[model samples]
Target chain A: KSVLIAGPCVIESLENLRSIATKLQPLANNERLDFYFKASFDKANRTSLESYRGPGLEKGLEMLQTIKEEFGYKILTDVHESYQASVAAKVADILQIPAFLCRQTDLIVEVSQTNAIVNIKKGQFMNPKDMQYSVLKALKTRDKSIQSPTYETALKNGVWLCERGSSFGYGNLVVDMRSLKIMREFAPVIFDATHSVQMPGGDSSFAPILARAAAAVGIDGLFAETHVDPKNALSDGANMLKPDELEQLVTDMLKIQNLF
Target chain B: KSVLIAGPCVIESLENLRSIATKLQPLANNERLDFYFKASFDKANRTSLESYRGPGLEKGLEMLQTIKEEFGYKILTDVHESYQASVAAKVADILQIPAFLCRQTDLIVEVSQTNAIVNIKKGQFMNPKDMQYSVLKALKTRDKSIQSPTYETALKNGVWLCERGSSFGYGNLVVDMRSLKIMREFAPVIFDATHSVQMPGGDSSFAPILARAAAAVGIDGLFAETHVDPKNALSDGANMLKPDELEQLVTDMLKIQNLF
Candidate 1:
């Protein structure tokens, strides 16, 4: 079954995170989707240095871990450094390697070495075919230092490549759907429903139009960040989805996913 | 002054190449453009093995040389192999690294070492910002084995980056016009007006829609393959610009270029 990984771009507060997951939990069941609650403990690659970077690792992971237990849902979060992989792995079901750092060999190796499913956002600078090496590196890791049932599962089905669009120019991004096909040849593909619409250094709004397009393109998973009031959010305020908007978008996307 | 590197996609014949140059020569002069006639001698990466691969390098270079001498025009052609770089550089003014081969380090090194102007098409799989390394790699060839005044000149202005669209999906290409702005930050950028319109393995026709779009994007140079009768041309037949059609397109592009 297709999956939806949705959350605010960053964890602003406990109440916000709880509210988002509660809203999304039933939506996934109602729509017949395998679901994961995605949020970030840290915003490592914000375009501006002064932007909100979410809660730091320890508290952030604790909150995410708490939500996972309470909501009984799989959790997803991104790790910016190699060291953060194991730490995040303790709580998150998936450890996402940010797109800008997608090619950092050490990060991929370490993250994959974790028990968590490793999702590498295809670098804006990377060719889709070249990503096979990233997958290979992750699968090749023979790190016996840690043992977990999650790591065993990861050995078979832990790698996913996410497409959040490429540098079409300085401030814009373009979703090349063919990237979905090329990457899928190696592993499951996730369409970053919100980031694909990003106008880096320019705007904070998501592309609702391209969101529908990605569903029709048939991705293995879809990711989006949402907030009840995006403009008031502390981080990535520009691109978060409203609860109702996310509800409607995912409902429509489910029908499109069902066709395939 | 901006440049227009225009010609057919491949060397079909002496007459066809000559006519394209003859027609383009005056239009370029009228528009105040430094023009180079571009046509590949051998297309090494044809999707199908049976497709026409252009006249063998010898005769193709001979014809291109004749056109260069006869019309007093600079010539540009793509080289697929390292050994062919010196051969092509001897007769042609510019050697282009095909988009598919842009990252082939050996080819870029060999071509730049030949002392010919090098035009590297940014791979559809690459990021515009990362192309600086490709340009740097070409410039770093320390070939003490041979040196010439031509090579000295090349060390100053020999490298150029061409954008010919990126893989948008399995069989389609999307022109990220923002690529123009991004690549220009590193070096001169050429918009492959025709190839950017290519549908990869699917169609052989140009997207006239993107042609106008690129012109307005304001590239340092524009590349398009043309023929008197494109429909019946031997290779890339479906994508070539008609002689008269090319004339009108360039004329319009010149006007757009002037506004900037």
Candidate 2:
């Protein structure tokens, strides 16, 4: 059964965060689908230095706390640097390893130590089978004593592998449906459908194209960035799904998943 | 307009060579599309050590020489090592850099130094924009003293960037149509239709899903490895197009190209 993992690309503001979740919550609840609200506290890996990062960890975690408290939704957010892992893990139910940082041994180790359910986005440059090494790095930390009580609980849950697409050419990304089957052999696989469509340094979006394809291929989950107003969003504006569109997209995904 | 680069995957036998060219030649002549017969003298990078490595270069080139002599077709073959470039360059019109070898600076320099029209297959690990660096590496040789008269000739012709597909996961490849437009910005782009469908290290076979897509996207050329009998061919048989299929494939590609 595939779940929905979505939120704005970054936490623009508490108001923006609340607006998106309110729109998304009912859609998932109506479908009885497992869901996670994803937002980045600080987009430490933005392409350019001038790009907008989210509210810092303190403010961002507080907003996510509010979303969880008020809405009763699971939370997911990416932790970029090693130092950010423990703090981010406290609030986020699933601490994600950004695609570019998937191979950083120290960072994956830290995220694993948080014992929070770790979601590791496969690196654009990595081969799916090679990701077993990343999983092993995380599992290696299972024996270490950790501060978080949830880290012990997380040992059995382990980690999830997310595919955000691979670098195709200069400014493009490609989703290989076959990757879903391959990565699923290693861990629960989530398809980051929106990011898979990004043109990297160019203006392009094909989230629907990829999401449909991934659904047909039978993934364990789908990850998309959503916004109340996409064009005005602070980060990855070009690829964000509008909040209103989530219903039909998830509805269609359910239909496709049934066929598969 | 795109040309056709077609032939058997490897020179299985002189009889196999004659059979495939005989089938493909009229297709090209009938369409009036520029064409080059492509086959490798050595299957140097097969995944398994026990796999067929094609006929040795000496016998392979002799057969290629025969094909060119009898068919009057321009020849294309990949060179694995720097030393093989000079020998292969003598007979083949284009000295191709395999995707696995595309990033080897020394090999690119050596192949570029050959000055035969160079075709650099984009590495599974490479981004399209990064191919500019490969092209630059090849072009850098123009200033250094050269050996073959063709080296100087190649300087005028330069290189062609070929997309064989990117590593999608562990054992599959996906064609990103956008790559055709992206790589064309660097040089002429060739879509290796058959290989693009490769299931890298698994029970992989050719996926025609790509040929139709690439043709619609429009490319400077289409590349497919053909066989008189693919089921029993010596190397990469699963991915080789049967000789009979070439005519219709090219015809359909032509129609799609017209639409683009």
What would the TM-score be for candidate 1 when compared with the true structure?
0.50
TM-score of chain B of 1: 0.88
Tens digits of lDDT, candidate 2, B1-260: 46778888787778878888888777557645878898888774343323577887888888899999999998999986547888888899898987756665656767766747889898776677677666666665764443322323433656788998876655567777787777776677888877777564522234455777787776777788887788888877777777567666777788887775
Docking level of model 2? incorrect
lDDT of 2 at A56: 84
lDDT of 2 by residue, A1-260 (tens): 46789898888888888899888877658655778898888764343323576788889999999999988888999876678889888888899987765666667777888858888898776787777667656665774443222322333656788998776645567777787888777677888877777565533246776777788887777888889888788886777888667667777888998875
Listed in order, each prediction's TM-score against the native is: 0.50, 0.50
In model 2 chain B, the worst 10-residue window by lDDT is B146-155
Each model's DockQ score: 0.03, 0.05
Kindly state the fnat score of candidate 1: 0.02
Which residue pairs show collisions in model 2? A115-A151, A169-B128, A170-B128, A170-B129, B2-B220
